[PDB]
Each structure stands twice: as C-alpha cells, then as structure tokens.
C-alpha cells in the first residue's frame, strides 16, 4: 500500500530562490504519455 503524508501549504512565498532557464523545445507526446525531443 502507498500512503500520503502532508508536506506543507500551497502558498506563493515572496523572496524565494530564483533559478533555472526558459528553453523553447520541439517535443512529441506518445500514446504512453512519454515526451520526446523532435529535431
């Protein structure tokens, strides 16, 4: 059996760590729900 445990509220937190880039990517979605890079 899988079980759940609460980990926090869903809140925008002002002054949080800002990171990661913003790539534009060509992708295909298969019937199994797996994304892949179209090139």
Partner 1 sequence: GETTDGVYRVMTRRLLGSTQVGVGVMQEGVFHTMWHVTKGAALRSGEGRLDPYWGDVKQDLVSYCGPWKLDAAWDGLSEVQLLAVPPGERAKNIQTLPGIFKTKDGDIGAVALDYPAGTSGSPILDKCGRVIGLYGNGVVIKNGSYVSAITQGKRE
User: Can you give the binding site for partner 1, defined by CB under 8 A?
Assistant: 1-13, 16-29, 31-33, 35-37
> Which phi and psi angles does 37 have, rounded to 5°?
-85, 115
Q: What is the rounded CA–CA span in Å between residue 31 and residue 26?
A: 17
Contact 28, 36 (CB under 8 A): yes
Q: Whole-number minimum distance, CB 14 to partner 1, in Å?
A: 9
Question: What's the min distance (Å) between Cβ of 15 and partner 1?
Answer: 9
Q: How far is the CB of 19 from partner 1 (least distance, A)?
A: 6
């Amino acid at each position: 059996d899988m079980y759940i445990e609460r980990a926090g509220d869903i809140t925008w937190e002002k002054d949080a760590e800002v990171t990661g880039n913003s790539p534009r990517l060509d992708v295909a979605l298969d019937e199994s729900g797996d994304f892949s890079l179209v090139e």
